[PDB]
């Protein structure tokens, strides 16, 4: 938690979210989207 408050680096999933894709024909980008789960934001 102390390094969370110090560190300049912040983490968002939006880089993946706008980089990958936009969207039973299993697309690899959609598969890794559901695998990475960018709706989660937890970095303990």
């Amino acid at each position: 938690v102390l390094l969370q408050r110090i560190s300049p680096l912040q983490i968002d999933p939006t880089i993946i979210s706008n980089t990958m894709s936009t969207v039973q024909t299993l697309s690899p980008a959609s598969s890794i989207l559901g695998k990475l789960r960018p709706s989660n934001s937890d970095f303990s």
Partner: protein, 137 residues
Amino acid sequence: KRIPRKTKGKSATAEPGTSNCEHYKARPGIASVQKATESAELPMKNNDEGTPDKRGNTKGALVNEHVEARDEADDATKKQAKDTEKAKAQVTYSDTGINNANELSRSGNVDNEGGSNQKPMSTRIAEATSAIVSKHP
């Protein structure tokens, strides 16, 4: 002066150059990093299992070493679920692929001598000295 304990005893005008105007705010956030540092200050607790009291009995729960070690892993996982609150812990101390069957914690089950501690040491000493007591006619 007098200082109390914490434990238990034995028995012209104003020259310019300042003005409280305060235009700058803390860029990382001084209260946030302040509370983080205050949380980080805390010294760790000790375990006390396997250590005697004044009388001689080892204080602690009467439980096997390995099952207490796995109990403490599960409870630290529970406090991990408390912090950064979820339904489940992200980082976990139980459910590891590493086999850790040969782990021993500290308990009150094993005394300092190397025997067991289902019967307390003070009771053993009083019984041993009560085995030989002689009386009057």
